[PDB]
Symmetry: C4
């Protein structure tokens, strides 16, 4: 483990898949979204990523087992000509905020891996932190190439969630949700970032549903959001009582 | 020394040893435990580790001698077919909390070295930070593979110390007590972490006793714990004599 | 992205240019000077630098596009034998304060690249933080070689801007504005540092004009400074009203 | 002038034999650096090489005459005019690697040792400071060595010395930075030598403790060096202290 390493269990017959990322970040939006999507498509884990730039610890898993912090790749093989093969990543962590080089190298490895499957296109998901939400959560969209605005807009027409095409020039997207797109763009890849508005300090199941709604709209997939509905239901009532 | 270096004095006549880790950590628990085990077994020193990821200083040793910070490997050859040979590592320090990469590199070099002797199995010892202790220190256990819970449970049947099989999902073991097992598991190695409840800012001889009772019990060894008892008693006295000094 | 990298779009027909640097720094002085110089000369972009030592984020550009933080090289081809060709570097950022090694790597890569065009001479622009400025901001000068004092002093003869030859021995110039000269010097390159006195916590157009007047005087160019004058006046009005 | 790593720019390969490597880089009280600089001056030691490092702070310094220059270390040699005193290599400079980059300290110290070994260097003397809360008498110099057998050796070079040298006993104490690492890394390569640290308050430029340390050094070397420029500096700073504490 002298560098970031990917352990491969299975080499699935997917072709030109879309790489979807939902690693930990603001309100765990991306992580929830990605975990939900994996569950509903019954995606199969085929690989895990370990990095010596991750925090130097193991985690307690189920049944008293220890394990390094990792990220995991899942695939989904479309049964149609009408839908894309997917690779979804999610995981325990990102590189700590104090090692920028490590983010570049982890993202670099993630990209090298998905490209072996002919991956060209990336969707990242995460949250955008706001002091107060004033209604339904908006989803903020940004792309790697201008011509993709019109492309993702057409695939989004008829969607519940309000997607806002960001115009906050000089704003930043920190960590994998940005770097996979910024580094991917240098090597001929392309895609879109979708960040849901969120208070950020809580697990945000509601904002995760909105993001996943935009993403599944793009993909032309329909999936059950109830699990996320009730999580939002629960945590809302918990917050009531905490502020009393 | 562009990287972590191990200086090896001899190749000991050992095989399939268990690798035991007691580096500095919470309450100096793992360290006291390992040093006591070194001493009672008359384990022999055979290698030392230096690292450019350790703090950039020398320590004053006995006799006005300076030396880089280091870890030390000791071995014990069993006199019989019913006890495993041991490699035991301890030392001055671990890599500082700000250099995660260095922890992986030091742990990885320790694992490469110990596998040269056929090591498969690892036991790590250390502390689990707790706001207060209610009587007898408990020992928390976690393993690298599920099947090993009853393996080690069997070995531990009848032990005096209470051993809790950890259920704190998403809790963390930081540094070598954790990385040796986490990285070891990627290489097909296996083992168990045993961490003792400790206040943490004290040299905790008594929690060290409890961890080392659990470990020697798994090993089939009986080791005299006297010197640890005596250190726990001495530090107990001095602690409460500080709890009276705080009338200032 | 294993290392700091430069992407070359064009190799212009320039030779022995002067390398001018204006990266972000105190007051954004160097950066505003460089951008204004680029705009007024209509200099042309020809290369971009990316680094895994830069902060691990992408930025939002215009029209909802994401990109890695980067630096950009611009050229100006002199139309006559009495002015020098120029390479001007500017960009989003420098390496963060916590990674010294990265500053050296990025500075060394810039110098490798400009040396391909026969660059020996460097002018760095930036700011010098002061607790107050009464009067016009002064520009502090320092050079790589003692014999260059007279050299740039003659070229500065006539200038409105007051240029002080620094004597604060043991003072420091931090980041590219210092490293490009210090590293340059080891390769047989040479040049001068110009730092405008600035309060430092505001975008300092007035001090940018002052540094750029000293630089264009040295280059023998006459540049319209109006856009900077106007920006300076807008910000002084703001500051006066904000103190109220 | 690639700065991918620490690099030494060599001006001359001095005709020197088995020199003693003397280090006096910045640190506590600037004790080692003043001592080195005054030794260089009094001895007319000649500058023969310069060290630059991408692990130094990312800045240039303003020198005399409005000149910028990277931060650097400089190597000076003294050719002994006779077989009764050793040739010397003396290092000093603007700075050491920052406290946050332990790896960088090992790398820099590493390159220094590689360099001096090209000239046959075996023996190292490092000079610096040891922070105290007050000084009661004349400053003492605290000594420690790479090998036990060297205590007898340096102790018999020091008999009749006007400064008092304490063979330190603070087992577990640390020497941080090049003063420690040159000896610590050196002894891994078979080199050897001594640490001399002068008692100092640290926040002040301490010419007096520098004289103490340089007296012990020159003694060990068999050299008589005029200490007056240090005397006068110590005089100046002791009357500036007084008057700065009149106002506070
Ligand atoms: Au790496
Ligand atoms: Au990342
Ligand atoms: Au995020
Ligand atoms: Au939708
Ligand atoms: Au495209
Ligand atoms: Au390393
Ligand atoms: Au470690
Ligand atoms: Au521990
Ligand atoms: Au037991
Ligand atoms: Au690098
Ligand atoms: Au600046
Ligand atoms: Au820089
Ligand atoms: Au002018
Ligand atoms: Au290095
Ligand atoms: Au020192
Ligand atoms: Au000489
Ligand atoms: Au050092
Ligand atoms: Au003496």
């Amino acid at each position: 483990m002298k560098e970031t390493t990917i352990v491969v269990y299975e080499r699935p017959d997917i072709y030109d898949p879309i790489f979807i990322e939902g690693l930990p970040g603001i309100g765990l939006v991306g992580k929830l979204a990605a975990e939900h999507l994996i569950q509903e498509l019954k995606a199969k884990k085929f690989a895990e990523l370990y990095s010596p730039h991750f925090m130097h610890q193991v985690l307690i898993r189920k049944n008293s087992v220890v394990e390094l912090m990792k990220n995991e790749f899942y695939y989904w093989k479309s049964p149609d000509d009408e839908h894309r093969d997917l690779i979804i990543v999610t995981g325990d962590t990102q590189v700590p905020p104090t090692d920028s080089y490590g983010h570049f190298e982890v993202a670099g490895k993630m990209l090298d891996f998905v490209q072996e499957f002919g991956t060209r296109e990336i969707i990242t998901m995460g949250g955008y932190q706001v002091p107060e939400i004033q209604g339904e959560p908006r989803v903020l969209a940004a792309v790697t190439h201008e011509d993709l605005i019109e492309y993702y807009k057409s695939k989004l027409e008829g969607c519940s969630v309000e997607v806002i095409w960001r115009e906050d020039e000089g704003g930043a997207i920190v960590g994998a949700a940005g770097l996979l797109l910024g580094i991917g763009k240098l090597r001929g890849m392309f895609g879109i970032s979708l960040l849901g508005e969120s208070l950020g300090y809580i697990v945000d199941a509601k904002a995760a549903k909105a993001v996943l709604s935009a993403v599944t709209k793009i993909l032309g997939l329909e999936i059950d959001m109830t699990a996320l509905d009730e999580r939002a239901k629960e945590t809302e009532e918990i917050l009531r009582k905490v502020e009393e």
